[PDB]
């Protein structure tokens, strides 16, 4: 199989976590770990070719000892996200994660997702963004966000209903090999 290296970055509390394991144990955790610590390698067949899919999950900005640095180098490509119920997590985007992805990463290829995409249609997440004047993210804000960025690829998913998770990986795999 051919080896790839896969680091996934974006704000605190956007669900990358939960889209590592709900993609590779196929089960939603029960229980909280900041940071996936166990090594998974994911075994992914595209357009024939067998490809072992290193999974490196990233730390927040508090967690100092296991800071993201240490994490970026030989990527072959990222999974940058945000999560639909959050417009800043979306404005996080151009304004932190691309500046950094390109500052330590600058020729790897991004997918951007969208995580939690089954709170587009909660009523509790919609409520209390209307109370901002915000809204859940729209797929074309997540479209025209993927053009600013140069990202290979604008991607949906829900770590809870597994809605688009093996899409997410199997576009990942697809621009690592390229
Ligand atoms: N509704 C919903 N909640 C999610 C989803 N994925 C994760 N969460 C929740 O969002 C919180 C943060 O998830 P986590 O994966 O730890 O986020 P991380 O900080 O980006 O690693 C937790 O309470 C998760 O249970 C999802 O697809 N949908
Ligand atoms: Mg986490």
Redesign the pocket.
């Known amino acids: 199989a051919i080896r790839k290296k896969l680091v996934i970055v ?10 590592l ?2 993609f590779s144990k196929d089960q ?2 029960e229980v ?4 996936v610590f166990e090594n998974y390698v994911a075994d992914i067949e595209v357009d024939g070719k067998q490809v072992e899919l290193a999974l490196w ?1 990233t730390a ?1 900005q508090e967690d100092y000892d296991r800071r993201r640095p240490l994490s970026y180098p030989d990527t072959d490509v990222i999974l940058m ?1 945000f ?1 639909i ?1 959050s417009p800043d997590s979306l404005e996080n985007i151009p304004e932190k994660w691309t500046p950094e992805v390109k500052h330590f990463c600058p020729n790897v290829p991004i997918i951007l997702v969208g ?5 587009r249609n ?1 009523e509790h997440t919609r409520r209390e963004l209307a109370k901002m004047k915000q809204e859940p993210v729209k797929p074309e804000e997540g479209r025209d966000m993927a053009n600013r960025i140069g990202a290979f690829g604008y991607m949906e ?5 597994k809605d688009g998770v093996r899409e997410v990986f199997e576009m990942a795999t697809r621009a690592a090999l390229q």
Do not use: E, R
């Open positions: 974006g704000d605190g509390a956007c669900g990358k976590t939960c889209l394991i709900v939603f955790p909280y770990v900041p940071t999950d927040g996200c999560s119920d995580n939690k995409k089954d709170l909660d998913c829900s770590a809870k209903t």
